[PDB]
């Protein structure tokens, strides 16, 4: 079933007892933490044989 991705994340938050408005009020900040964490994986894997 297609769903917009920021709405799927509201369901994931609701699964861990965080009320879904806490995502939307912080959406750009949460997106930037995830985007940054992905970058650290590449550097970790590139450096750490």
């Amino acid at each position: 079933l297609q769903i917009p991705f920021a709405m799927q994340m509201a369901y994931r938050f609701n699964g861990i007892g965080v009320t879904q408005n806490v995502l939307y009020e912080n959406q750009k900040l949460i997106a930037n933490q995830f985007n940054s964490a992905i970058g650290k994986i590449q550097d970790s894997l590139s450096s750490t044989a």
């Binding site: 917009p4 920021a6 709405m7 369901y11 009320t19 408005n21 939307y24 009020e25 959406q27 750009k28």
Partner: protein
């Protein structure tokens, strides 16, 4: 609980896993702050049942 949906002319809320359109009200919704912050929000009425009863 559940999701907002539209049939084009109207807006409803439904549970997630079986389509059951219900009118949107202060019963089946909760507020959090002013409109400005939320990406993708839309205008509509949200109905509030108490008003006509106070007007009885």
């Amino acid at each position: 609980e559940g999701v907002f949906v539209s049939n084009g002319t109207h807006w409803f809320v439904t549970q997630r896993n079986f389509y059951e359109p219900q009118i949107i009200t202060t019963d089946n919704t909760f507020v959090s702050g002013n409109c400005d912050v939320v990406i993708g929000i839309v205008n509509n009425t949200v109905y509030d049942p108490l008003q006509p009863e106070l007007d009885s």
